[PDB]
Structure formats: structure tokens, C-alpha cells
Tab-separated table of N, CA, C and O in Angstrom:
chain	number	residue	atom	x	y	z
Y	167	UNK	N	5.105	18.062	-20.656
Y	167	UNK	CA	5.498	16.907	-21.049
Y	167	UNK	C	6.218	15.915	-21.373
Y	167	UNK	O	7.393	15.255	-20.844
Y	168	UNK	N	5.442	15.204	-19.748
Y	168	UNK	CA	6.217	13.964	-18.722
Y	168	UNK	C	6.545	12.738	-19.712
Y	168	UNK	O	4.792	13.183	-19.982
Y	169	UNK	N	6.793	11.518	-19.261
Y	169	UNK	CA	5.712	10.753	-19.591
Y	169	UNK	C	5.386	9.362	-19.207
Y	169	UNK	O	6.162	8.340	-19.181
Y	170	UNK	N	4.117	10.241	-18.411
Y	170	UNK	CA	3.031	9.507	-17.997
Y	170	UNK	C	3.809	9.402	-16.597
Y	170	UNK	O	3.004	9.865	-15.332
Y	171	UNK	N	4.600	8.298	-16.611
Y	171	UNK	CA	5.366	7.730	-14.979
Y	171	UNK	C	5.251	9.141	-14.372
Y	171	UNK	O	4.948	8.656	-12.698
Y	172	UNK	N	6.197	9.561	-14.135
Y	172	UNK	CA	7.101	10.923	-13.653
Y	172	UNK	C	5.436	12.134	-13.052
Y	172	UNK	O	6.052	11.940	-12.040
Y	173	UNK	N	4.556	11.493	-14.048
Y	173	UNK	CA	3.371	12.728	-13.571
Y	173	UNK	C	2.606	11.720	-12.380
Y	173	UNK	O	1.676	11.991	-11.253
Y	174	UNK	N	2.132	10.159	-13.075
Y	174	UNK	CA	1.563	9.227	-12.172
Y	174	UNK	C	2.154	8.943	-10.634
Y	174	UNK	O	1.269	9.458	-9.692
Y	175	UNK	N	3.496	9.251	-10.915
Y	175	UNK	CA	4.616	9.128	-9.421
Y	175	UNK	C	4.111	10.404	-8.117
Y	175	UNK	O	3.660	10.306	-7.506
Y	176	UNK	N	4.465	11.706	-9.466
Y	176	UNK	CA	3.741	13.164	-8.456
Y	176	UNK	C	2.489	12.837	-7.740
Y	176	UNK	O	2.375	13.196	-6.762
Y	177	UNK	N	1.661	12.392	-8.926
Y	177	UNK	CA	0.025	12.018	-8.258
Y	177	UNK	C	0.084	10.502	-7.330
Y	177	UNK	O	-1.264	10.559	-6.104
Y	178	UNK	N	0.935	9.613	-7.061
Y	178	UNK	CA	0.576	8.872	-6.273
Y	178	UNK	C	1.828	8.325	-5.065
Y	178	UNK	O	1.385	8.522	-4.303
Y	179	UNK	N	2.864	8.251	-5.766
Y	179	UNK	CA	4.447	8.479	-4.830
Y	179	UNK	C	4.178	9.829	-3.974
Y	179	UNK	O	5.620	9.728	-5.023
Y	180	UNK	N	4.225	10.111	-3.437
Y	180	UNK	CA	4.148	11.158	-2.783
Y	180	UNK	C	5.295	11.379	-2.009
Y	180	UNK	O	5.903	12.425	-2.157
Y	181	UNK	N	5.488	10.547	-1.353
Y	181	UNK	CA	7.109	9.755	-0.847
Y	181	UNK	C	7.695	10.142	0.392
Y	181	UNK	O	6.469	11.160	1.220
Y	182	UNK	N	8.441	9.457	1.088
Y	182	UNK	CA	9.511	9.791	2.543
Y	182	UNK	C	7.721	9.088	3.023
Y	182	UNK	O	6.806	9.440	4.176
Y	183	UNK	N	8.474	7.860	3.978
Y	183	UNK	CA	8.122	6.771	5.018
Y	183	UNK	C	7.977	8.425	6.182
Y	183	UNK	O	8.705	8.632	6.255
Y	184	UNK	N	6.939	8.114	7.083
Y	184	UNK	CA	6.442	9.029	7.813
Y	184	UNK	C	5.097	8.200	9.019
Y	184	UNK	O	4.049	8.594	8.095
Y	185	UNK	N	4.841	7.176	9.758
Y	185	UNK	CA	3.925	6.589	10.034
Y	185	UNK	C	2.879	7.141	11.363
Y	185	UNK	O	3.305	7.117	12.596
Y	186	UNK	N	2.600	8.099	11.339
Y	186	UNK	CA	1.446	9.302	11.482
Y	186	UNK	C	0.902	9.830	10.793
Y	186	UNK	O	0.757	9.204	9.899
Y	187	UNK	N	0.641	10.998	11.260
Y	187	UNK	CA	-1.045	12.375	10.753
Y	187	UNK	C	-1.968	11.637	10.038
Y	187	UNK	O	-2.784	10.902	10.841
Y	188	UNK	N	-2.008	11.740	9.224
Y	188	UNK	CA	-2.929	11.713	7.970
Y	188	UNK	C	-3.494	12.646	6.868
Y	188	UNK	O	-2.727	12.429	5.954
Y	189	UNK	N	-4.206	13.442	7.334
Y	189	UNK	CA	-4.692	13.940	6.987
Y	189	UNK	C	-3.521	15.554	5.858
Y	189	UNK	O	-3.572	16.242	5.156
Y	190	UNK	N	-3.212	15.969	6.668
Y	190	UNK	CA	-1.763	16.648	6.380
Y	190	UNK	C	-1.492	16.260	5.496
Y	190	UNK	O	-1.140	17.105	4.158
Y	191	UNK	N	-0.497	14.734	5.244
Y	191	UNK	CA	-0.038	14.729	4.182
Y	191	UNK	C	-1.123	14.853	3.003
Y	191	UNK	O	-1.052	15.356	1.496
Y	192	UNK	N	-2.389	14.216	3.492
Y	192	UNK	CA	-3.359	14.295	2.265
Y	192	UNK	C	-3.525	15.155	1.475
Y	192	UNK	O	-3.921	15.686	0.466
Y	193	UNK	N	-4.131	16.471	2.268
Y	193	UNK	CA	-4.348	17.528	1.934
Y	193	UNK	C	-3.246	18.267	1.469
Y	193	UNK	O	-2.968	18.890	-0.078
Y	194	UNK	N	-2.809	18.436	2.080
Y	194	UNK	CA	-0.823	18.988	1.652
Y	194	UNK	C	-0.568	18.553	-0.078
Y	194	UNK	O	-0.032	19.278	-0.238
Y	195	UNK	N	-0.385	16.892	-0.181
Y	195	UNK	CA	0.015	17.094	-1.398
Y	195	UNK	C	-0.809	17.161	-2.779
Y	195	UNK	O	-0.808	17.874	-4.199
Y	196	UNK	N	-1.880	16.991	-2.244
Y	196	UNK	CA	-3.119	17.720	-3.092
Y	196	UNK	C	-2.578	19.260	-3.788
Y	196	UNK	O	-3.377	19.209	-4.566
Y	197	UNK	N	-2.737	19.863	-3.063
Y	197	UNK	CA	-2.694	21.247	-2.495
Y	197	UNK	C	-1.842	21.642	-3.812
Y	197	UNK	O	-1.398	22.015	-4.380
Y	198	UNK	N	-0.085	21.113	-3.140
Y	198	UNK	CA	1.350	21.016	-3.834
Y	198	UNK	C	0.801	20.577	-5.292
Y	198	UNK	O	1.074	21.266	-5.952
Y	199	UNK	N	0.246	20.020	-5.858
Y	199	UNK	CA	0.099	19.394	-6.958
Y	199	UNK	C	-1.348	20.381	-7.801
Y	199	UNK	O	-1.409	19.473	-8.827
Y	200	UNK	N	-1.955	20.786	-6.962
Y	200	UNK	CA	-3.058	21.349	-6.841
Y	200	UNK	C	-4.146	20.387	-8.268
Y	200	UNK	O	-4.523	21.213	-8.897
Y	201	UNK	N	-4.084	19.200	-7.309
Y	201	UNK	CA	-5.151	17.855	-8.033
Y	201	UNK	C	-6.850	18.747	-7.323
Y	201	UNK	O	-8.064	18.620	-7.924
Y	202	UNK	N	-6.717	19.851	-6.642
Y	202	UNK	CA	-7.652	20.722	-6.235
Y	202	UNK	C	-8.635	21.783	-7.399
Y	202	UNK	O	-8.810	22.379	-6.276
Y	203	UNK	N	-8.398	21.003	-8.452
Y	203	UNK	CA	-9.633	22.191	-9.264
Y	203	UNK	C	-11.155	21.666	-9.282
Y	203	UNK	O	-10.887	20.593	-8.530
Y	204	UNK	N	-11.386	22.376	-10.116
Y	204	UNK	CA	-13.296	22.566	-10.252
Y	204	UNK	C	-14.174	20.884	-9.463
Y	204	UNK	O	-14.757	20.967	-9.319
Y	205	UNK	N	-13.264	19.599	-9.294
Y	205	UNK	CA	-13.691	18.585	-8.227
Y	205	UNK	C	-12.192	17.721	-7.886
Y	205	UNK	O	-11.453	17.420	-8.948
Y	206	UNK	N	-12.958	17.210	-7.168
Y	206	UNK	CA	-11.288	16.507	-6.524
Y	206	UNK	C	-11.153	15.410	-5.683
Y	206	UNK	O	-12.421	14.584	-6.741
Y	207	UNK	N	-10.309	14.941	-6.094
Y	207	UNK	CA	-10.407	13.474	-5.572
Y	207	UNK	C	-10.613	12.462	-5.104
Y	207	UNK	O	-10.202	12.329	-3.672
Y	208	UNK	N	-11.488	11.766	-4.845
Y	208	UNK	CA	-12.838	10.918	-3.984
Y	208	UNK	C	-11.576	10.574	-3.059
Y	208	UNK	O	-11.986	10.388	-2.092
Y	209	UNK	N	-10.768	9.952	-4.005
Y	209	UNK	CA	-10.446	8.674	-3.650
Y	209	UNK	C	-8.839	8.879	-4.258
Y	209	UNK	O	-8.775	9.179	-5.485
Y	210	UNK	N	-7.095	8.788	-3.552
Y	210	UNK	CA	-6.314	8.002	-4.515
Y	210	UNK	C	-4.961	7.213	-3.596
Y	210	UNK	O	-5.490	8.045	-2.133
Y	211	UNK	N	-4.661	6.402	-3.286
Y	211	UNK	CA	-3.604	6.164	-2.451
Y	211	UNK	C	-1.884	6.287	-2.712
Y	211	UNK	O	-1.144	6.009	-3.594
Y	212	UNK	N	-1.131	6.970	-1.845
Y	212	UNK	CA	-0.362	7.580	-1.044
Y	212	UNK	C	0.168	6.859	-1.150
Y	212	UNK	O	0.379	6.206	0.250
Y	213	UNK	N	1.751	6.489	-1.994
Y	213	UNK	CA	2.794	5.746	-1.722
Y	213	UNK	C	3.912	6.680	-0.583
Y	213	UNK	O	4.263	7.720	-1.180
Y	214	UNK	N	4.584	6.307	0.484
Y	214	UNK	CA	5.033	6.759	1.348
Y	214	UNK	C	6.270	6.205	1.124
Y	214	UNK	O	6.830	5.697	2.416
Y	215	UNK	N	7.964	5.677	0.428
Y	215	UNK	CA	8.448	4.606	0.252
Y	215	UNK	C	9.350	5.413	-0.927
Y	215	UNK	O	9.243	6.171	-1.522
Y	216	UNK	N	10.611	4.232	-0.632
Y	216	UNK	CA	11.395	5.335	-2.083
Y	216	UNK	C	11.219	4.754	-3.158
Y	216	UNK	O	10.454	3.732	-3.565
Y	217	UNK	N	10.969	5.352	-4.210
Y	217	UNK	CA	10.508	5.683	-5.316
Y	217	UNK	C	10.881	5.128	-6.004
Y	217	UNK	O	10.997	5.027	-7.454
Y	218	UNK	N	12.853	4.401	-5.909
Y	218	UNK	CA	13.085	3.654	-6.353
Y	218	UNK	C	12.600	2.107	-6.668
Y	218	UNK	O	13.079	1.728	-7.792
Y	219	UNK	N	12.580	2.371	-5.865
Y	219	UNK	CA	11.758	0.693	-5.532
Y	219	UNK	C	10.090	0.594	-6.136
Y	219	UNK	O	10.672	-0.668	-7.160
Y	220	UNK	N	9.590	1.133	-6.248
Y	220	UNK	CA	8.704	1.560	-7.738
Y	220	UNK	C	8.894	0.353	-8.591
Y	220	UNK	O	8.248	-0.276	-9.235
Y	221	UNK	N	9.814	1.532	-9.498
Y	221	UNK	CA	10.384	0.877	-10.818
Y	221	UNK	C	10.387	-0.294	-10.433
Y	221	UNK	O	10.618	-0.678	-11.257
Y	222	UNK	N	11.274	-0.726	-9.766
Y	222	UNK	CA	11.962	-2.070	-9.470
Y	222	UNK	C	10.044	-3.228	-9.504
Y	222	UNK	O	10.515	-4.092	-10.036
Y	223	UNK	N	9.632	-2.636	-8.377
Y	223	UNK	CA	8.081	-2.992	-7.967
Y	223	UNK	C	7.507	-3.697	-9.833
Y	223	UNK	O	6.772	-4.318	-10.159
Y	224	UNK	N	7.583	-2.654	-10.323
Y	224	UNK	CA	7.116	-2.594	-12.210
Y	224	UNK	C	7.789	-3.657	-12.640
Y	224	UNK	O	6.900	-4.310	-13.300
Y	225	UNK	N	9.376	-3.741	-11.997
Y	225	UNK	CA	9.797	-4.977	-12.987
Y	225	UNK	C	9.847	-5.958	-11.686
Y	225	UNK	O	11.441	-6.803	-11.950
Y	226	UNK	N	8.982	-6.503	-11.386
Y	226	UNK	CA	9.295	-7.278	-10.629
Y	226	UNK	C	7.734	-8.495	-10.863
Y	226	UNK	O	8.749	-9.337	-11.416
Y	227	UNK	N	6.875	-8.750	-9.891
Y	227	UNK	CA	5.987	-9.492	-9.841
Y	227	UNK	C	4.750	-8.891	-10.552
Y	227	UNK	O	3.772	-8.608	-9.959
Y	228	UNK	N	4.420	-9.870	-12.510
Y	228	UNK	CA	2.684	-9.453	-12.219
Y	228	UNK	C	2.271	-10.771	-11.886
Y	228	UNK	O	1.933	-11.185	-11.236
Y	229	UNK	N	0.829	-9.935	-11.273
Y	229	UNK	CA	-0.628	-10.550	-11.064
Y	229	UNK	C	-1.352	-10.322	-11.433
Y	229	UNK	O	-2.041	-9.050	-11.861
Y	230	UNK	N	-2.113	-11.586	-11.871
Y	230	UNK	CA	-3.294	-11.306	-12.354
Y	230	UNK	C	-3.997	-9.806	-11.697
Y	230	UNK	O	-4.948	-11.465	-10.440
Y	231	UNK	N	-5.041	-9.234	-11.711
Y	231	UNK	CA	-5.511	-8.051	-10.997
Y	231	UNK	C	-7.350	-9.244	-10.859
Y	231	UNK	O	-6.671	-9.475	-11.925
Y	232	UNK	N	-7.917	-8.103	-10.470
Y	232	UNK	CA	-9.103	-8.620	-10.623
Y	232	UNK	C	-9.950	-8.471	-11.510
Y	232	UNK	O	-11.379	-8.363	-11.767
Y	233	UNK	N	-9.295	-8.689	-12.808
Y	233	UNK	CA	-10.555	-8.122	-14.098
Y	233	UNK	C	-9.077	-9.418	-14.866
Y	233	UNK	O	-9.648	-9.541	-15.886
Y	234	UNK	N	-7.460	-9.403	-15.140
Y	234	UNK	CA	-6.715	-9.236	-15.590
Y	234	UNK	C	-6.751	-8.467	-16.730
Y	234	UNK	O	-5.652	-8.729	-18.117
Y	235	UNK	N	-6.718	-7.289	-16.315
Y	235	UNK	CA	-6.029	-6.012	-17.222
Y	235	UNK	C	-5.218	-5.316	-16.859
Y	235	UNK	O	-4.702	-5.754	-16.247
Y	236	UNK	N	-4.702	-4.673	-18.732
Y	236	UNK	CA	-2.798	-4.510	-18.174
Y	236	UNK	C	-2.492	-5.113	-18.028
Y	236	UNK	O	-2.375	-5.976	-18.955
Y	237	UNK	N	-1.389	-5.914	-17.745
Y	237	UNK	CA	-0.415	-6.137	-16.794
Y	237	UNK	C	0.538	-6.187	-15.058
Y	237	UNK	O	1.015	-5.420	-14.851
Y	238	UNK	N	-1.060	-6.190	-14.409
Y	238	UNK	CA	-0.548	-4.875	-12.895
Y	238	UNK	C	0.094	-6.108	-12.689
Y	238	UNK	O	0.368	-7.198	-12.359
Y	239	UNK	N	1.916	-5.569	-11.846
Y	239	UNK	CA	2.577	-5.553	-11.430
Y	239	UNK	C	2.273	-5.131	-9.525
Y	239	UNK	O	1.836	-3.997	-8.637
Y	240	UNK	N	2.298	-6.343	-8.376
Y	240	UNK	CA	3.035	-6.346	-7.136
Y	240	UNK	C	3.646	-6.406	-6.531
Y	240	UNK	O	4.437	-6.702	-7.334
Y	241	UNK	N	3.856	-5.635	-5.522
Y	241	UNK	CA	5.583	-5.761	-5.215
Y	241	UNK	C	5.597	-6.691	-4.330
Y	241	UNK	O	4.999	-6.993	-3.836
Y	242	UNK	N	7.188	-6.555	-4.088
Y	242	UNK	CA	7.745	-7.054	-3.515
Y	242	UNK	C	7.472	-7.436	-1.810
Y	242	UNK	O	7.345	-8.801	-1.576
Y	243	UNK	N	7.336	-6.719	-1.142
Y	243	UNK	CA	7.343	-6.782	-0.235
Y	243	UNK	C	5.871	-5.907	-0.233
Y	243	UNK	O	4.890	-4.975	-0.791
Y	244	UNK	N	4.854	-5.559	1.759
Y	244	UNK	CA	4.546	-4.704	1.929
Y	244	UNK	C	4.673	-2.998	2.064
Y	244	UNK	O	6.029	-3.238	2.627
Y	245	UNK	N	4.274	-1.804	1.587
Y	245	UNK	CA	5.158	-0.631	1.544
Y	245	UNK	C	3.753	-0.094	2.112
Y	245	UNK	O	2.901	-0.063	2.378
Y	246	UNK	N	4.601	1.375	2.893
Y	246	UNK	CA	4.060	2.039	3.734
Y	246	UNK	C	2.920	2.477	2.748
Y	246	UNK	O	3.652	4.266	1.708
Y	247	UNK	N	1.400	3.211	2.083
Y	247	UNK	CA	0.685	3.740	2.019
Y	247	UNK	C	-0.302	4.078	3.153
Y	247	UNK	O	-0.956	3.705	3.917
Y	248	UNK	N	-0.737	5.655	2.607
Y	248	UNK	CA	-1.391	6.542	3.278
Y	248	UNK	C	-2.109	6.495	2.353
Y	248	UNK	O	-2.223	7.333	0.969
Y	249	UNK	N	-3.131	5.717	2.688
Y	249	UNK	CA	-4.546	5.941	1.724
Y	249	UNK	C	-5.694	6.730	1.591
Y	249	UNK	O	-6.289	6.967	3.112
Y	250	UNK	N	-5.538	8.235	0.782
Y	250	UNK	CA	-6.101	9.302	1.151
Y	250	UNK	C	-7.867	8.955	0.545
Y	250	UNK	O	-7.824	9.179	-0.608
Y	251	UNK	N	-8.148	9.609	1.008
Y	251	UNK	CA	-10.084	9.567	0.679
Y	251	UNK	C	-10.536	10.721	1.140
Y	251	UNK	O	-10.004	11.381	1.852
Y	252	UNK	N	-11.967	11.575	0.685
Y	252	UNK	CA	-12.197	12.785	0.941
Y	252	UNK	C	-13.443	12.493	1.831
Y	252	UNK	O	-14.364	11.208	1.510
Y	253	UNK	N	-13.479	12.554	3.056
Y	253	UNK	CA	-14.315	12.881	4.082
Y	253	UNK	C	-15.777	13.657	3.452
Y	253	UNK	O	-15.641	14.448	2.986
Y	254	UNK	N	-17.022	13.092	3.733
Y	254	UNK	CA	-17.985	13.074	4.577
Y	254	UNK	C	-18.530	14.576	4.630
Y	254	UNK	O	-18.866	14.599	5.853
Y	255	UNK	N	-17.434	15.458	4.327
Y	255	UNK	CA	-17.117	16.949	4.841
Y	255	UNK	C	-16.776	17.667	3.338
Y	255	UNK	O	-16.765	18.879	3.348
Y	256	UNK	N	-16.243	17.101	3.020
Y	256	UNK	CA	-14.961	17.842	1.598
Y	256	UNK	C	-16.915	18.231	0.802
Y	256	UNK	O	-17.160	17.478	0.308
Y	257	UNK	N	-16.095	19.890	0.797
Y	257	UNK	CA	-16.879	20.638	0.281
Y	257	UNK	C	-16.499	21.650	-0.696
Y	257	UNK	O	-16.298	22.701	-0.595
Y	258	UNK	N	-15.988	20.942	-2.088
Y	258	UNK	CA	-15.017	22.156	-3.021
Y	258	UNK	C	-15.738	23.353	-3.390
Y	258	UNK	O	-16.707	23.535	-3.222
Y	259	UNK	N	-14.527	24.236	-2.736
Y	259	UNK	CA	-13.583	24.614	-2.845
Y	259	UNK	C	-12.555	24.247	-1.636
Y	259	UNK	O	-11.391	23.322	-1.695
Y	260	UNK	N	-13.815	23.848	-0.856
Y	260	UNK	CA	-13.824	23.385	0.886
Y	260	UNK	C	-13.184	22.404	0.801
Y	260	UNK	O	-14.159	21.414	1.708
Y	261	UNK	N	-12.615	21.591	0.162
Y	261	UNK	CA	-12.442	19.597	-0.063
Y	261	UNK	C	-11.679	19.703	1.138
Y	261	UNK	O	-10.769	19.985	1.638
Y	262	UNK	N	-11.745	17.948	1.228
Y	262	UNK	CA	-11.463	18.073	2.601
Y	262	UNK	C	-10.655	16.631	2.767
Y	262	UNK	O	-11.531	15.700	3.346
Y	263	UNK	N	-9.330	16.148	3.197
Y	263	UNK	CA	-8.865	15.476	2.702
Y	263	UNK	C	-8.615	14.158	3.672
Y	263	UNK	O	-8.039	15.441	5.284
Y	264	UNK	N	-8.607	13.203	3.944
Y	264	UNK	CA	-8.651	12.094	4.967
Y	264	UNK	C	-7.584	11.066	5.415
Y	264	UNK	O	-8.519	10.048	3.942
Y	265	UNK	N	-6.703	10.408	4.779
Y	265	UNK	CA	-5.748	9.302	5.067
Y	265	UNK	C	-5.420	8.342	5.684
Y	265	UNK	O	-6.232	8.037	7.047
Y	266	UNK	N	-5.461	7.077	5.094
Y	266	UNK	CA	-5.537	5.707	6.382
Y	266	UNK	C	-4.087	4.988	6.282
Y	266	UNK	O	-4.296	4.338	4.648
Y	267	UNK	N	-3.572	5.058	6.897
Y	267	UNK	CA	-1.564	4.336	6.696
Y	267	UNK	C	-2.243	2.843	6.581
Y	267	UNK	O	-2.734	2.358	7.484
Y	268	UNK	N	-1.265	2.201	5.965
Y	268	UNK	CA	-1.519	1.087	6.142
Y	268	UNK	C	-0.154	0.713	5.072
Y	268	UNK	O	0.175	1.067	3.959
Y	269	UNK	N	0.727	-0.375	5.556
Y	269	UNK	CA	1.773	-1.194	5.130
Y	269	UNK	C	0.737	-2.550	3.987
Y	269	UNK	O	0.604	-2.957	4.422
Y	270	UNK	N	0.872	-2.396	2.556
Y	270	UNK	CA	0.613	-3.256	1.755
Y	270	UNK	C	1.197	-3.582	0.470
Y	270	UNK	O	1.822	-2.491	0.427
Y	271	UNK	N	1.057	-4.163	-0.604
Y	271	UNK	CA	1.893	-4.177	-1.385
Y	271	UNK	C	1.213	-3.262	-2.263
Y	271	UNK	O	0.302	-3.767	-2.998
Y	272	UNK	N	1.951	-2.248	-3.119
Y	272	UNK	CA	1.518	-1.728	-3.856
Y	272	UNK	C	1.320	-2.233	-5.184
Y	272	UNK	O	2.311	-2.871	-5.292
Y	273	UNK	N	0.250	-2.567	-5.763
Y	273	UNK	CA	-0.365	-3.344	-7.446
Y	273	UNK	C	-0.145	-1.914	-8.853
Y	273	UNK	O	-0.951	-0.860	-8.147
Y	274	UNK	N	0.768	-1.700	-8.973
Y	274	UNK	CA	1.256	-0.692	-10.117
Y	274	UNK	C	0.992	-1.734	-11.309
Y	274	UNK	O	0.853	-2.173	-11.366
Y	275	UNK	N	0.827	-0.511	-12.015
Y	275	UNK	CA	0.887	-1.116	-13.618
Y	275	UNK	C	2.161	-0.356	-14.797
Y	275	UNK	O	2.271	1.130	-15.027
Y	276	UNK	N	2.837	-0.762	-14.819
Y	276	UNK	CA	4.524	-0.788	-15.702
Y	276	UNK	C	3.545	-0.745	-17.391
Y	276	UNK	O	3.429	-1.629	-17.452
Y	277	UNK	N	4.329	0.175	-17.857
Y	277	UNK	CA	5.179	0.185	-19.241
Y	277	UNK	C	5.610	1.433	-19.473
Y	277	UNK	O	6.542	1.621	-19.424
Y	278	UNK	N	5.255	1.307	-20.777
Y	278	UNK	CA	6.024	3.067	-21.610
Y	278	UNK	C	7.693	2.423	-21.670
Y	278	UNK	O	8.137	3.578	-20.908
Y	279	UNK	N	7.624	1.956	-22.300
Y	279	UNK	CA	9.508	1.686	-22.368
Y	279	UNK	C	9.871	2.929	-22.917
Y	279	UNK	O	10.255	3.998	-23.252
Y	280	UNK	N	11.715	3.313	-21.545
Y	280	UNK	CA	11.902	1.751	-20.664
Y	280	UNK	C	10.964	2.239	-19.543
Y	280	UNK	O	10.380	2.708	-19.465
Y	281	UNK	N	10.549	0.242	-19.566
Y	281	UNK	CA	9.173	0.475	-18.658
Y	281	UNK	C	9.702	0.834	-17.449
Y	281	UNK	O	10.585	0.197	-16.302
Y	282	UNK	N	8.549	1.553	-17.352
Y	282	UNK	CA	7.977	2.733	-15.780
Y	282	UNK	C	6.741	2.786	-15.405
Y	282	UNK	O	5.975	2.306	-16.017
Y	283	UNK	N	5.877	2.671	-14.487
Y	283	UNK	CA	5.170	2.965	-12.891
Y	283	UNK	C	4.013	3.686	-13.995
Y	283	UNK	O	4.895	4.573	-13.919
Y	284	UNK	N	2.936	3.698	-14.932
Y	284	UNK	CA	2.161	4.788	-16.073
Y	284	UNK	C	0.780	4.573	-14.464
Y	284	UNK	O	0.407	6.331	-14.814
Y	285	UNK	N	0.263	3.269	-13.727
Y	285	UNK	CA	-0.962	3.321	-13.552
Y	285	UNK	C	-0.268	2.772	-12.455
Y	285	UNK	O	0.090	2.285	-11.772
Y	286	UNK	N	-1.913	3.060	-10.803
Y	286	UNK	CA	-1.704	2.130	-10.227
Y	286	UNK	C	-3.378	1.066	-10.370
Y	286	UNK	O	-4.010	1.317	-10.901
Y	287	UNK	N	-3.429	-0.095	-10.080
Y	287	UNK	CA	-4.690	-0.735	-9.993
Y	287	UNK	C	-5.370	-0.722	-8.330
Y	287	UNK	O	-6.234	-0.682	-7.617
Y	288	UNK	N	-4.277	-0.430	-7.029
Y	288	UNK	CA	-4.662	-0.945	-6.075
Y	288	UNK	C	-3.790	-1.425	-5.127
Y	288	UNK	O	-2.241	-1.629	-5.319
Y	289	UNK	N	-3.987	-1.810	-3.213
Y	289	UNK	CA	-2.718	-2.072	-2.252
Y	289	UNK	C	-3.530	-3.324	-2.192
Y	289	UNK	O	-4.200	-3.002	-1.500
Y	290	UNK	N	-2.697	-4.335	-1.957
Y	290	UNK	CA	-2.177	-5.424	-1.198
Y	290	UNK	C	-1.551	-5.953	-1.038
């Protein structure tokens, strides 16, 4: 019975800067949050930075996304994301995730008074 945001965050703001590894965080978080149910997540972008800033990003700069949908917000600065993907190897229940470390502006979706980020659009 989360306000969406908290769960969205735990699915996305993995947290803690770490410019290394890749696969480890990818599979670890998915396992930890047991999102490796019925079918696993072919793509998901894991943020590894100050969760406090995410709530600020939400309340920083609206950008018209590649649709003009929601009211998506671009981060102040480029943040550490580990862009997580299932390799052409992932075989549920033997799911196999691999991340791509990139420093890009997360594009988050804020709402749900008091305004908190509840979805993600993309990162650039």
C-alpha cells in the first residue's frame, strides 16, 4: 500500500554510485525486489545516485518528451544510470540481466501530491 512513488523508486532508483560491474546490480536488484516472476523485465534503467535529488529532478525542469505525454521532467545534471537489459541468454526462470553504465539526465514522471516521481520516461 505504497504511494506508487516508493515502489517505482525501488524498481528504478536502485541507488548508490558505483562506476563498475554491470550484471551484478542488474540481477541483484531484480532478485532482491523479486521482479523475476512469471516473465522478467526485458529492459529497465537503474539509477545509482542521491534519491533526494530524484525528488528534486521531479520538481526541476519539465521537458516535452517524444510525445508530449504525462509531464516528464529532465534531471538538472547527468546522473549515473545502469541501463539494465536481458541478454539473448535470459531464459526464465534462468533470467540473465546485463547493465550499461551511462551518465545521462534521467527523465522522470512526477505527480501524486505531494509531488513525487512515480514513473520514468527515458535518460538523456
